Structure formats: structure tokens, C-alpha cells
């Protein structure tokens, strides 16, 4: 994503979080890890490990609602559509 989901500021680096597979600002994403070490900035999920990536290394999904399940290969993001959207309905 561009604007951090927790800070809203323009993400300069893709702070990827696992196993959520969610992205944020690798800067505020690490401050959160140093804060709880296991809570996504917005999903508050067990942040296993945060990693930095380029704003072109993940694939954002845009089907309906706020589905921002990024991935590492269109095949996984495509697999996300048929796994949770299935043509929406
Ligand atoms: Zn931020
Ligand atoms: Zn998350
Ligand atoms: Zn989706």
C-alpha cells in the first residue's frame, strides 16, 4: 500500500508482516514490533517477523470491501481471489 494503514503517512518502504502477510511502513512497522513484538499495527495479529520490501515486490488485491491481502506472486494473490472472493458471489 502507499499510505500507512496505521499512520496514514506515505509508506516509503513496504514493511511486510507475517504470517498476516500485511504491509505497512517498515519504519512504523518496526516501532510496533519494538512496542509489542507481536501485534499488527491494524490487524493486531501475532506479528511473527517484519521484513522490508520494495513497493513493487507485493501484489495488492482490489475486489471488494477493504481486501488488502498482499502476496509474493500473482499466483498467490490470484489464489486469494478464488479462495475468499470466488468472483465475489
Ligand atoms: Zn507510517
Ligand atoms: Zn496485518
Ligand atoms: Zn481479495
UniProtKB/Swiss-Prot annotation:
Disulfide bonds: none annotated. Residues 43-89 are annotated as: HYB domain. Phosphorylated on tyrosine residues. E3 ubiquitin-protein ligase that mediates ubiquitination of several tyrosine-phosphorylated Src substrates, including CDH1, CTTN and DOK1. Targets CDH1 for endocytosis and degradation. Associated component of the WMM complex, a complex that mediates N6-methyladenosine (m6A) methylation of RNAs, a modification that plays a role in the efficiency of mRNA splicing and RNA processing. Its function in the WMM complex is unknown. A zinc finger (RING-type) spans 4-44. The chain holds residues 106 to 194 of 491 of the full protein. The HYB domain forms a phosphotyrosine-binding pocket upon dimerization, and mediates as well the recognition of its flanking acidic amino acids. Homodimer. Interacts with tyrosine-phosphorylated SRC substrates. Component of the WMM complex, a N6-methyltransferase complex composed of a catalytic subcomplex, named MAC, and of an associated subcomplex, named MACOM. The MAC subcomplex is composed of METTL3 and METTL14. The MACOM subcomplex is composed of WTAP, ZC3H13, CBLL1/HAKAI, VIRMA, and, in some cases of RBM15 (RBM15 or RBM15B). Also a component of a MACOM-like complex, named WTAP complex, composed of WTAP, ZC3H13, CBLL1, VIRMA, RBM15, BCLAF1 and THRAP3. Detected in heart, brain, spleen, lung, liver, skeletal muscle, kidney and testis. It is found in: Nucleus speckle; Nucleus, Nucleoplasm; Cytoplasm. Belongs to the Hakai family. This is E3 ubiquitin-protein ligase Hakai.
Amino acid at each position: 500500500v502507499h499510505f500507512c494503514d496505521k499512520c496514514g503517512l506515505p509508506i516509503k518502504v513496504y514493511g511486510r508482516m507475517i504470517p498476516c502477510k500485511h504491509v505497512f511502513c517498515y519504519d512504523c512497522a518496526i516501532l510496533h514490533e519494538k512496542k509489542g513484538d507481536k501485534m499488527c499495527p491494524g490487524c493486531s495479529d501475532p506479528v511473527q517477523r517484519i521484513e522490508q520490501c520494495t513497493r513493487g515486490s507485493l501484489f495488492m488485491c482490489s475486489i471488494v470491501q477493504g481486501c488488502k491481502r498482499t502476496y509474493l506472486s500473482q499466483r498467490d494473490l490470484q489464489a486469494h481471489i478464488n479462495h475468499r472472493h470466488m468472483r465475489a458471489g
